[PDB]
Amino acid sequence: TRADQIPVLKEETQHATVSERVTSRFTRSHYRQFDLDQAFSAKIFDRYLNLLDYSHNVLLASDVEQFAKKKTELGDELRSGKLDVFYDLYNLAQKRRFERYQYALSVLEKPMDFTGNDTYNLDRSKAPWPKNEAELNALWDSKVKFDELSLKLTGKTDKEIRETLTRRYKFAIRRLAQTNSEDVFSLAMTAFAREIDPHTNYLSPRNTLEDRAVKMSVKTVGKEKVGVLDIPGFYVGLTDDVKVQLQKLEKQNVSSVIIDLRSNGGGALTEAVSLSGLFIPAGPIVQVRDNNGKVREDSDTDGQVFYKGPLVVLVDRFSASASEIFAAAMQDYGRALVVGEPTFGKGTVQQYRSLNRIYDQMLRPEWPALGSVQYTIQKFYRVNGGSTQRKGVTPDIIMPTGNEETETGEKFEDNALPWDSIDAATYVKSGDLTAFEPELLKEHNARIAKDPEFQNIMKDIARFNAMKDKRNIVSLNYAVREKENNEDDATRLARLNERFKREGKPELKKLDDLPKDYQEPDPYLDETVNIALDLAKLE
Amino acid sequence: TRADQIPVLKEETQHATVSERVTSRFTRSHYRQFDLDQAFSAKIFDRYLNLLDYSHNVLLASDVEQFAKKKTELGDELRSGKLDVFYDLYNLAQKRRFERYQYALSVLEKPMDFTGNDTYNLDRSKAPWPKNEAELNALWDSKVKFDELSLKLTGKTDKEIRETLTRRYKFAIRRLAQTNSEDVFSLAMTAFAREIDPHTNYLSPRNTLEDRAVKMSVKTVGKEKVGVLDIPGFYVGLTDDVKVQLQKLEKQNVSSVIIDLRSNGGGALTEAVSLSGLFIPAGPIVQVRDNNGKVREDSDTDGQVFYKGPLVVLVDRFSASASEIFAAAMQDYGRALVVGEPTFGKGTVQQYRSLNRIYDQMLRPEWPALGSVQYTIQKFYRVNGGSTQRKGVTPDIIMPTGNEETETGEKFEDNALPWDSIDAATYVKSGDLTAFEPELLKEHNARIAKDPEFQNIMKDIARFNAMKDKRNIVSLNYAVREKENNEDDATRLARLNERFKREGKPELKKLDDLPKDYQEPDPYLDETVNIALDLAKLE
Amino acid sequence: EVLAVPLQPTLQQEVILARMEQILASRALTDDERAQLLYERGVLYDSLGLRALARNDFSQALAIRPDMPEVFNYLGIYLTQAGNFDAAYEAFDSVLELDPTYNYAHLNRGIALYYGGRDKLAQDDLLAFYQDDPNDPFRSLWLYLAEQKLDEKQAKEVLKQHFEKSDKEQWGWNIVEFYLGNISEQTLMERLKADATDNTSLAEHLSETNFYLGKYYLSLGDLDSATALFKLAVANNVHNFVEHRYALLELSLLGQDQD
Amino acid sequence: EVLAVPLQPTLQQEVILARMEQILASRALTDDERAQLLYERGVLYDSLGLRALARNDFSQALAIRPDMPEVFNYLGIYLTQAGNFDAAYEAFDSVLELDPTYNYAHLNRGIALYYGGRDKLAQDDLLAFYQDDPNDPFRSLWLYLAEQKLDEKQAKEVLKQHFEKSDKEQWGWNIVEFYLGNISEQTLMERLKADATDNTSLAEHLSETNFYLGKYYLSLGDLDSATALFKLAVANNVHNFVEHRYALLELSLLGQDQD
């Protein structure tokens, strides 16, 4: 591509229909009751710009102010399938992006000088759009500098930086004239979808097993054992696999069991009710609620308790969906103790439906296969009546990282549904741990105040914290960005060596000697094994 | 047969069942609601004797008084099918009849002398049974004398009387040892049936068209014509045939029409409603009433009148069933005048049902075909609400024989159902003849007082009447029974000759010259033709 | 009022019809078992209120095996529903000739003779059926209806005995107790609510009790209350209850008084 | 009370089923006409209350010719009866994509959205269906029910207009007049008796009027009178009247409050 020989993208025959079908389902059958009015179509516009120009880099402010005149019209376009503003706004900026990469190549030839006091703001997600071509060219000068500098700091000659950043920018141009009419369609439907809730999606038509199983282990403190179940996800027939392993562990006289659901991001709700059932006799696990107003109770029907021994549940900020059900049930029945970070807050069920009707091959046989949509149909509620959503399971024992406010969680996703409560279900608590908790905590706090790995974690936190202003403001000075890397490498080598002398291992002469496959310690697991034994002691 | 080598008759396997089936239908589904109690089974006994020994001739009084001890048991025999009294009482008298015909032959050899003053009573229907064998032999002496005498009076030699009365009596013995088990069964079921009503019947299993149509004619008085329809019976599609002939007669400018239903003994009720319809526009013809309590109206649906001309209906004591419906309708609507004798009084419908069930060939395949039963299900009522039964249609103009009390009519049949009335139907009279009737009668009476054929009829009546005491008391004196025949022959020849001199025909020298196929005059038809014209004159 | 949801075709009922509809189109069957299934389906059709289609399957059963008393049972009932008591009698006779212990033929023939004006003959049958199970309160009730036509005074004394000498367990005796004057209609319905469990049970209780209350008021000559109660009895669609069938016949004889 | 004899399967209905049952077993048929008859029989099955067996014949129709909007109509209705409004919406969309003048899809989709908590979307459909025939009083009634949920005051003024500007001829406007407060329920039923001719007509009048009286009392929060009136509406077995179907659904949501 040397010029504007980028194909002009047009809406395909099928698309008008496919749009009408998407709009029908979103506007009628979504848990979220919204009006596709002017306010909504205006918000669908701003999201759509943020999908074309993420960093506010490619379009003129005048490009934006011109199309913006026409943003309350998007609800009409979607309902009718005439997506002219979506196709026009994409076509321009198909041009603008071309003419930014043809400029970025020109600038790569100029002399490189990394000795200024300029910074670079990584977050133009909310910046004003460039007012004119001089400001456009300035934002793209910064960008080829940042691209050059980040490469230079991997020890590259000015010569091989131009050779690699040409490869990149020239491929950015090929990507650009290889996009198709469905690409633009997909992104219009995505702006719509993602303005309802963060889990709603359009899914384009298709173009021309035991690795994720339960691992069990045992870990000792003196003469006493603790079984640990690493559960990677709620895969179908999980409850069968842990039943095998709960027998292996029952016999080996283990004092306590840990279910490890860290970074376990969900799976089959049924595996969550069946697993809950291994630990509590009978009772309701979860209240599900539908788009129209109606509640339902999943229960555990086999009234037998496959393991009555002391139980502990290890979760982090990435424990989600089904994991939060399970963890929430054990907490609510006081069947098991919860340790780690507050969980994600995924309190909602999404359903796939096809945009394909049985009479399509019949009437419009020229057409291709049509897409499918994914959208929220149900919410989850705990047996105590509260919702999983945007609150998550909060641990009985919160590791230090959980007291720190993080930027990861359903709560931080755009237009995530709010937090709700319905009435509690009828259930009888299998036990009560309010009794043991302040003592488990006395011990926990005493232990980690000494542990140097938890000292290292609580130092990491003070750092991450104190350097959150400059969070998205990177220096463009090679010296300062060479020194920054050396002080990171140096603090890492010191940590690794502080550790190796505790352990009677040889110290490392340099960071590069560390095996590629070195395993870090798991201080969170190691401290929970102690919590598990403390609990066993107290019953 | 020379002795008691008459087969002893036994009840067949099928019969017990067939009896139970007959009893079921009679006791439950008959218009007549009766109890098959002791009184009923006693009456079934007396009827059964009258069927074995009509003339009280064959059994001893002791034969009767012995079995009579057991007559309240017949209801049990019928309900169960154990018909031992019926089979015993038949078997004896199968013997008694044999031994009366073997005695009657002996007596035929003795000398014949017809010069006594002995009479012979033709009606022993209610006589006491013979008290001993001397009285038995006496009743059978009388009987061979009566048989001999009635033959002698056809000019037979004492020699050829013995040859013919041997033929007869010897064949009476062969009949007697050729009867079968079904014969006795049939007669038991008949005693039962005929004790309910005179039209109810058992019908034994089978052992190893335009002649009866309407004839039309015309008959004149001076220059004026009268159409006459001779209707022999209500055969299916009668109403089609009279429609042809009503067109033939309408065109030939006939002043009046006569329907002739004398001795027309019924047929399809539907042909009675359709024929009624030719003469009245629309309206109900007959109210039918069922065994359970429920009334129904047959009507004429085609509202057109195929003939509005003056109508007359000629009936006698043998006009019955459907004829009485038709005649009763025309009378009630004042559509037509009724002439003749009061009709029979058949105010009831009988139905055939088979005693055969579909599983018989299956289970009892040795059996033969089984019989059928016929029984009353419905009554008829006139549109004025009165019943046809035992009252009949009474003529507006009654011929002389109708003022005389006759011994023929439903009224005289045994256990004929009584006379009833329900409410009248809703109908509008097509006319009214109470106006014309006393004048039609002035004329009628004047005319027949002169007519010598009606003088002859009214002399016949005075005779039939004055000789009703001696009605069933025949002289056994040859002289008196030779003279009786000569005076009958002489009075007949005088009538025929009185007639032939009125007519300008040659007189007969003796009764024997009269052609075999001589046609008598029809004075009743001839006088009704006049009534028909008198009616035409008065409208 | 005490009202149920009118009963509706259950999915079990609709599923079985569809299976049968095809087990009977596949010619893989004995005569004897093709005939057994055609009977089985008529009972299903009958239980849905589809009597014409059941009459059809039952006639197809007897054209194949005329040996079957159970089929003559239904043919006779329909003949009683239709007003044709003569033919009804014929059918039930067939039933007790093919199997004389087929007791429910006695009830059906007895009822049929009741509607057919033959009370004394009805009493014989209804008393045979009583004596087969004196604890079943409806056997007493049907006999009462048949007696109360000739002698009310006697019919009542006899019901009273039938009740006194029974164990007084099954619901139906409460209907009997109201006929006897022991309990008001107020109490009768209090006990109905109390005895009923689910809606299918409530409909069954109402089908029965509305027919007997119906017959009761008709005694007094209250055609209006009778009519209302027969309609309400039928309004539960308990299609194969004798009270349903005979509340319809009752209603039919009352839509033949006004005509 | 004003009560009819509950409607019963007519002999015409039972005869046609038996014919069809065999015209469809004889393989002498186009695909296009085998599909037309399977639809014709589902409408018959539906009219008898046999929705599962009709769903069966309608699915067999669309597996053969998926071109048919009429079949999607019923599939959607059943889906509305079953509580599954999402799938209902899908079916009615299909109907108006295959034939956009298929007006009765608007009523059925509008009702379906009504039971499915989407009032404003229901109003659009019910008003499209009103404007197709402003003289049909039930089109006004359904729109009223859908409006009276957000704004009773407005719903009433709009019904009043719909009534004023109509010719006020067809029976249904008497129901409308009682909703408006012009005539008592006393008078409403006087006029019902007066307008009804035979029993089939009386059942139809009662199916409708009991459902609308039912919905009315439920407004006031009188669950007991509502319940009685829905049951009495269903008690006429006018199986294929929207009021029948939706008096059952109403009754089903009231047998989910007490649980």
Numbering used by the authors:
A (entry chain B), B (entry chain B): 27 to 234, 248 to 578
C (entry chain A), D (entry chain A): 28 to 286
Study authors write:
Prc (also named Tsp) is a member of the family of C-terminal processing proteases (CTPs) which features an embedded regulatory PDZ domain inserted into a serine protease domain. In Escherichia coli, Prc is involved in degrading abnormal proteins that are unfolded or partially folded and marked cotranslationally at the C terminus by an SsrA tag and that are exported to the periplasm through the Sec translocon. By associating with its adaptor protein, NlpI, Prc is also involved in the regulated proteolysis of MepS, a lipid-anchored hydrolase specific for PG cross-links. The activity of Prc strictly requires the PDZ domain, and the PDZ deletion completely abolishes the protease activity.
Nevertheless, the structures of the bowl-like body of Prc-ΔPDZ and Prc-L245A/L340G, including the protease platform, are superimposable with the structure of the resting Prc-S452I/L252Y. These structures confirm that, without the PDZ domain or the hydrophobic substrate sensor, Prc is maintained in the inactive resting state. These results support the finding that the PDZ domain regulates the protease activity of Prc by serving as an activator but not an inhibitor.
